[PDB]
Design a protein around this motif. Sequence first.
Motif, PDB file in Angstrom:
ATOM      1  N   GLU A  62      40.310  46.372  27.665  1.00  0.00           N
ATOM      2  CA  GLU A  62      40.488  47.115  29.046  1.00  0.00           C
ATOM      3  C   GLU A  62      39.848  48.310  28.256  1.00  0.00           C
ATOM      4  O   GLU A  62      38.938  48.955  29.154  1.00  0.00           O
ATOM      5  CB  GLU A  62      42.054  47.798  29.192  1.00  0.00           C
ATOM      6  CG  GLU A  62      42.121  47.734  30.396  1.00  0.00           C
ATOM      7  CD  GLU A  62      41.765  48.722  30.578  1.00  0.00           C
ATOM      8  OE1 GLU A  62      43.143  49.684  29.972  1.00  0.00           O
ATOM      9  OE2 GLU A  62      41.034  49.880  31.222  1.00  0.00           O
TER      10      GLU A  62
ATOM     11  N   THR B  39      33.005  44.890  37.475  1.00  0.00           N
ATOM     12  CA  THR B  39      33.977  44.825  38.661  1.00  0.00           C
ATOM     13  C   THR B  39      33.160  43.254  38.174  1.00  0.00           C
ATOM     14  O   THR B  39      33.831  42.517  39.577  1.00  0.00           O
ATOM     15  CB  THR B  39      32.857  44.530  39.767  1.00  0.00           C
ATOM     16  OG1 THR B  39      30.998  44.730  40.270  1.00  0.00           O
ATOM     17  CG2 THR B  39      33.246  46.966  39.786  1.00  0.00           C
TER      18      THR B  39
ATOM     19  N   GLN C 270      37.204  41.535  36.777  1.00  0.00           N
ATOM     20  CA  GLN C 270      38.216  42.076  37.833  1.00  0.00           C
ATOM     21  C   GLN C 270      37.863  41.717  38.981  1.00  0.00           C
ATOM     22  O   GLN C 270      39.020  41.923  39.656  1.00  0.00           O
ATOM     23  CB  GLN C 270      38.183  43.725  38.138  1.00  0.00           C
ATOM     24  CG  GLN C 270      38.206  45.235  36.844  1.00  0.00           C
ATOM     25  CD  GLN C 270      37.135  46.084  37.170  1.00  0.00           C
ATOM     26  OE1 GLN C 270      36.511  45.818  38.178  1.00  0.00           O
ATOM     27  NE2 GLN C 270      38.160  46.991  36.560  1.00  0.00           N
TER      28      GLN C 270
ATOM     29  N   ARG D 112      40.824  39.757  36.398  1.00  0.00           N
ATOM     30  CA  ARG D 112      41.565  39.895  36.732  1.00  0.00           C
ATOM     31  C   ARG D 112      41.657  41.941  37.135  1.00  0.00           C
ATOM     32  O   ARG D 112      40.902  42.087  36.364  1.00  0.00           O
ATOM     33  CB  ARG D 112      42.422  40.082  35.104  1.00  0.00           C
ATOM     34  CG  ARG D 112      43.166  39.154  35.094  1.00  0.00           C
ATOM     35  CD  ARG D 112      43.495  38.573  33.320  1.00  0.00           C
ATOM     36  NE  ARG D 112      44.992  39.573  32.571  1.00  0.00           N
ATOM     37  CZ  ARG D 112      45.602  39.027  31.901  1.00  0.00           C
ATOM     38  NH1 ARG D 112      45.732  37.766  31.396  1.00  0.00           N
ATOM     39  NH2 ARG D 112      46.053  40.154  30.483  1.00  0.00           N
ATOM     40  N   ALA D 113      42.668  41.815  37.743  1.00  0.00           N
ATOM     41  CA  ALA D 113      42.984  43.195  38.036  1.00  0.00           C
ATOM     42  C   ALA D 113      41.732  43.977  38.045  1.00  0.00           C
ATOM     43  O   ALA D 113      41.668  45.313  38.046  1.00  0.00           O
ATOM     44  CB  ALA D 113      43.363  44.276  36.476  1.00  0.00           C
TER      45      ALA D 113
END
Lengths: 238, 183
Positions: A127, A194, A197, A237-238
């Motif tokens: 992250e 992106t 994510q 993810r996320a």
Amino acid sequence: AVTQSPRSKVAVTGGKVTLSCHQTNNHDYMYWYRQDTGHGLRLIHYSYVADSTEKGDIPDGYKASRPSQENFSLILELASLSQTAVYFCASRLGGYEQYFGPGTRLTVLEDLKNVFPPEVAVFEPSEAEISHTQKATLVCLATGFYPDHVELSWWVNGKEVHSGVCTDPQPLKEQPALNDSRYALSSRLRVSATFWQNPRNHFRCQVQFYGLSENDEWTQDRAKPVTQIVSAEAWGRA
Amino acid sequence: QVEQSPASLVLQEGENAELQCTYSTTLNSMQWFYQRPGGRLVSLLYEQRGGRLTSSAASRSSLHISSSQITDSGTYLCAIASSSFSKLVFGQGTSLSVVPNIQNPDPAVYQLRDVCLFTDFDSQTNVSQSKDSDVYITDKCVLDMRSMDFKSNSAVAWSNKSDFACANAFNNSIIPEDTFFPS
């Protein structure tokens, strides 16, 4: 685009190994080489014409057979540890350009017990990296394999990818200073932030392993460590 | 009989590269091949090849590599064949390493949960194995994100051991004194 076959082989001392070479360049001269550090290529046998063979620089322990303009075979009758090497065959026009085959990784062993497939793991993008760089790096470790003949590739959304990929030039030894040491290997794949994510996105690490064949007998209380694929995977993810 | 030069070299991508082969007698023909570690022997030249590599004689044969790029990195070998049929005699090869021009270097080290990732350091930097015989560090490699045209250097350290931590994974390497270590 001259071919030789098998692509890899594991054998026990005293076993018979047959490497095959096939060329369609209509070349007359063919050759069988071994390559390994810190020698370079070394000539074993060669041929000028169908049905004849010549001792190369290191004909000992090997025989050759030239059954046709197109075929040249190498036979290791009673396999030894010193015959572990990478074997290339080659063909050439007598006054022109020489072409090499794709190669065979051949590994000779006291016993097949030491033979293991890779265990394979993937690591998800930090992250911190994303916050900092807006790019994201995934890592693949293949660990615990023997002998060290694997081919690692990444598959994004079920399609093999090459942009943003880097794999180590070669595997590293888990205990570098002894005998029968086992191997590890990592590879990297970087994508835009992106892209990680996106939870619809699927990343697979694929390692092709080259080990035993079905016909090798197997006594260990486990899966015969046969030539096989081993993978690991992650979604966005996320 | 065949002599190559230098033994090895490292240049920044974009630089031109001249490798050398020198033979003892009168040759007949001469071929250059190329091979990455792990790969197979690619015949580059029997002169030109597509145009980006070229060759010269003078018996000092030499090979010119225009605008080298990371993918040029490998081993370059010189084979001379002193008759139309007499076997090639291979020089000893030259280790070429082409190394990216990192514009905005960002020396960083991150934690990757299911490993430690040294990354984005500018090429001058070099990575050492640990004396610690149960810690695993890889040599840098360059990754080319052709998409957003970006080139990145990186290496990975890891070991199943509680003591080991990303703050100390590369202590054996000399690493930029302003390498960024996230909390």
